[model samples]
Structures are given as C-alpha cells and as structure tokens.
Target chain A: MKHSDEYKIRRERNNIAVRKSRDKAKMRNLETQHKVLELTAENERLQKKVEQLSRELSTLRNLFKQ
Target chain B: MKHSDEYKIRRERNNIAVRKSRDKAKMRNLETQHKVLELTAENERLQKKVEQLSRELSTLRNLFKQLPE
Candidate 1:
C-alpha cells in the first residue's frame, strides 16, 4: 500500500475506535438511568408499605388501650 | 504547519479524545455502582423495618383479642 493510504487507514481506524467508545459510554449512561428509576420506584413502594403498617399498628394500640 | 505535522496533531487529538471518553465512562460506572449499593442498603433497611413493624402489629392484635370485650 502507498504511504498515504496507510495513514488514511490508521486515521479511519482511530475514528472508529473513538466512535465505539462513545457509543459504549452512552449505553452505560442509559442503563444507569434505568436502574436508578427502578430502584427509586421500589424505594417508594417500600416506604408506603412502612407507612401503612405504622398506621395499622397505631390503630391497634388505640384499641388495646380502650 | 506542514501537512505531516497537521496529520500528527490530528492523531494526537483523537487519541486524547478517546482517553477522555474512556475516563468519563469509568467514572460513570463507578458512580452507578455506588448508587446501586446505596439503594440496596436502603432497601434492606426498609424491609427490616417492615418486618419489625409487622411483628409488633401482630403481637398487639393478639393482645387485643385476649382482652375482654
């Protein structure tokens, strides 16, 4: 291959490498966002459960006192 | 700059960009892992709280049943 052709090939490879790295990073970011949303939802659900149980316990205590 | 010099500069810049991108990705991965751990710990704690409260409620219910109407 010509010297110039070799340089072009190297440059193209480098560009592709950069693009691949960027794409991987974007995927990672999206996955992380999805995970955060999932965990947040679960956290909210558990908090609600605790709140519901707390209210039930209080009602029981009031009844026991009567 | 000479044509060869320009090519060399471009290559160097591209290399730097790739390194920077990889570094950013690494940082993001670490941050995500930390967040997952934090959320998991909170999840476990909340579950334990629910268990404890449920037991308390059950005990209270039993006591209430035993009392005279």
Candidate 2:
C-alpha cells in the first residue's frame, strides 16, 4: 500500500531472478563438462582402434611385399 | 529526501545485481555451447580417421591371397 512496500516487493523479485539465473548457469556448466568428458573418451577409443588397424595394414604390406 | 529516496537506492541496487546475474548466465551458456561445438568437431574428425584406417585394412585383406601384395 506504499512506495516502500512496492520497493520491497521488487527487491524480492530481483533476488529470485538472480538466484534462478545462477542455478541455471551452474547446471549448464555441468552439462558442458559432461559432454567434454564423453567426447574425450570417445576420441581416445577411436584413435586407439585406428592406430592398431593402421599398424596391421603396414605390417601386412611390408612383410609380404618385401 | 525521504524514505522514498532510500527506497529508490535499494531498488536500483537490486536491479543492478539482477542484471549482473543475468549477464553471467549468458556468458556461461555461450561458453558451454562453444565447448560442445569443439567436442563435436573433434569427435567427427577422429571417427573419420578410424573409418579410413579400417577401410584400408579390409581392402588389403581382400586383395591378397591369404596375405597382402
């Protein structure tokens, strides 16, 4: 019913919005890290497989062609 | 020059804090999207390399008689 009361209400609203924003940012950071983790693991696995397969190919070409 | 003046100051402060918070959130989201983009790109590159190597291995095996040429 007064200017002070309206100010108090607006203050509370801003506080809620800020808290919500921070929490959303926190979750987003976590999600980003999870994707990075999974991608690194996937990269390692595929690189290893490629290395092994390439090695086999080289050996086959060298051992018999020479 | 009264309670209303003090109220205005508090209200402005609160507004600033909210804007700062929102800006921080925007930056974080952008950073996250950038990371996802990099990871996705790297994954695709490495997977393509693996497929190429695997294909070479298969072709070599198919060409030779119980071995390679």
- Best candidate according to DockQ: 1
- Candidate 1: lDDT over CA atoms? 0.87
Candidate with top lDDT is 1
> How would you encode candidate 1's per-residue C-alpha lDDT over B1-69 as one tens digit per residue?
556988999999999999999899788778887898898899899989989998998998888788775
Q: Per-residue alpha-carbon lDDT of model 1 for A1-66, expressed as tens digits?
A: 547988989989999999999899788778887887789899899999999999998877786366
What residue runs in model 2 are displaced by over 4 Å at the alpha carbon? A1-25, B1-29, B65-69
Tens digits of per-residue lDDT, candidate 2, A39-61, equal: 87988888888889988988888
Identify the runs in model 1 with alpha carbons over 4 angstroms from their true place: A1-36, B1-11
Assess every candidate by TM-score.
0.62, 0.57
- Give the C-alpha miss distance for residue B63 in model 1, angstroms: 2.0
Give lDDT tens digits, candidate 2, residues B1-69.
Answer: 546988999989999999999999778778877887988898899988888888888888887766533
* Candidate 1 backbone collisions, by pair: none
Worst 10 residues of 2 chain A by lDDT: A57-66
